[PDB]
Amino acid sequence: RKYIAITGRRNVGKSSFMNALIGQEVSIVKSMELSPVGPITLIDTPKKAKKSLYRADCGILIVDDIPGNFEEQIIKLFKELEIPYFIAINKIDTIDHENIEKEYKKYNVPILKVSALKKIGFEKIGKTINSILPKDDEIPYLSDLIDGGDLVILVVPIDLGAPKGRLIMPQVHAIREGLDREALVLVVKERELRYAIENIGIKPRLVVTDSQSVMKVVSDVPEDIDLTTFSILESRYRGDLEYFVESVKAVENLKDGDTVIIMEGCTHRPLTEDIGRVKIPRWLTNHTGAALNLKVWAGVDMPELSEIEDAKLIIHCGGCVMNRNNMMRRVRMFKRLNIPMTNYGVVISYLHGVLERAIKPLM
Amino acid sequence: FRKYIAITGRRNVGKSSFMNALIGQEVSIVKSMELSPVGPITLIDTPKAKKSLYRADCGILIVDDIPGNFEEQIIKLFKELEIPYFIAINKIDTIDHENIEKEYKKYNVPILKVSALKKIGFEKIGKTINSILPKDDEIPYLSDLIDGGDLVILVVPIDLGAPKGRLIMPQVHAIREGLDREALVLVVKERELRYAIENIGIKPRLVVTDSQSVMKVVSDVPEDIDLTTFSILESRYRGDLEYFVESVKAVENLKDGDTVIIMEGCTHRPLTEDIGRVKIPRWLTNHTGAALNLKVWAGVDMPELSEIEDAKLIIHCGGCVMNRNNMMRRVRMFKRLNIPMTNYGVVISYLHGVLERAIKPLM
Ligand code: SF4
């Protein structure tokens, strides 16, 4: 579900607006179903307003007068917190088409005219929310980004992969994107990389390796050739690599009592996935020498403030099943709360001492 | 799909009683029958036996006396027609354990003892049939062609393929098998092949191309380098490349009245598959100058003799949905009838004048 922030002065009548908007509920048998957007949750916002706006996907600023110290203040807050918004002129039965043009046009945001008492204009909110809601459109995995025509890309997988005659999706995607850019894609097992580099006669533009063959291959790849991992490529692809890389530095500042949350992007994690639940916590404890308060969070939606509040670092999974939107919604939430958020991929690369090299072609 | 069992024996042996007693073994929960461990089976009574034995998967020779001119003749026929068999001694209530050791051991085939009248030994036929039935196990797609360890394999796909971030299965399979043999797999679009060959600095062991980019790439690939197509690789993989290549020569001898059967290995071909139904017939008519009697056979299971009898050539599909066994059964049936059988892949390569080159690394 999407989280809508409801902002306005005490006099504007937020209660009447929220009740009239709930009258738009379109469910078949303050949360509700509002078309064309799916399920939504209205957040009433009664000095860090950061504690309420932390998981807001978009906001509504309800006005009935000329922009003042309140309007200017919450607009600056929406901009700072990366929250899209629109202005809803309430009580149009008293002031009407006065503030629509003469003011508020300068904010370059949608302006709607409503009357909660007269029951007018609430059938236009759903479409307006849908238009401002952050759609986190797919960004290239390695294509338009790091490739060009005639370049050699070396994709280095492990000695063991997926079922007979098949390949894992990050490998297929990396090959497809390379061919899309008309680059030559050289797929090679870790044992053939040294031979390939030394005899291929074309300088590789990029070498992409599996995170489990990285420590071996870093040695085989000359320093002048760009090298990354599929874990780092995934990190950038669906998350925020810059934030994940900056947030991993928090590992150094971890104290004994400090809370670390292993955050999962799904409720269907395989029992064979012990990298975040078992492996990373043990590596973190050995590296820091801190008896950390390791906690695990797993769900499809957004955590409540109480579940994440005093976390010193969030270590989110790769997000194999998650889209960019859902991953970015979590990133913006931790950015708003100023809580460091990293990846399994960024943590692995950091502790192995290959992060600086792996991010060099991307940053 | 069901298995066909040939029932052979002299007029004096009880073929009728044997067949009726064996049908007594029917194990269906709801002359054809369900015989465990094998699935559905069809018994063929054999009163040029080639016309009855044409689709026989295996055979049973029913005896009650010392091997004669009939036994020796039928055994030679099973060997010539590539039909596995076993001996069944009927009327054991009269002769018993006499012919089991003293004779028939020389044929090195399973020998069973039965009595159709006394109802004894028929519960052992199912397991015996199952043991002699041709399995037709998976043969390598290209792994056997690239002794790898260091060999460069160039996989050349087209400018257009499958959906975004994905690749078609013959491409993924060819890459997987290359990595299985620890080869260096270079995936490249047809526009980059000339550039790859000239700058890659390693001599390719094999170049595999799409059948739609073959006429262009034959020019780009030096004569000393082995080159094949995915169509030719599929032909060998699930069919008989030697028979398909020998049988394509029949195209030259095609007369005006001559019957050509376009044979499909599934009843659900996509409407976008006009290569065998529309394209090949038009190419065949232009090439030969013959007003051929083009017919289409589609299904799973063996065709009846009347449906294929006077066909001068069979042009079978690639069989994407079929297994090696079902295709090989069709190959053996046409070999027995001495009817030429070819592929869409072998026909395309032949008419485009690239067959000799494409089969050179395989034959
Ligand atoms: S990596 Fe995939 S399977 Fe594992 S917890 Fe994250 S979303 Fe679930």
Ligand code: SF4
């Ligand atoms: S190639 Fe595949 S889809 Fe086409 S007729 Fe043969 S089995 Fe059916």
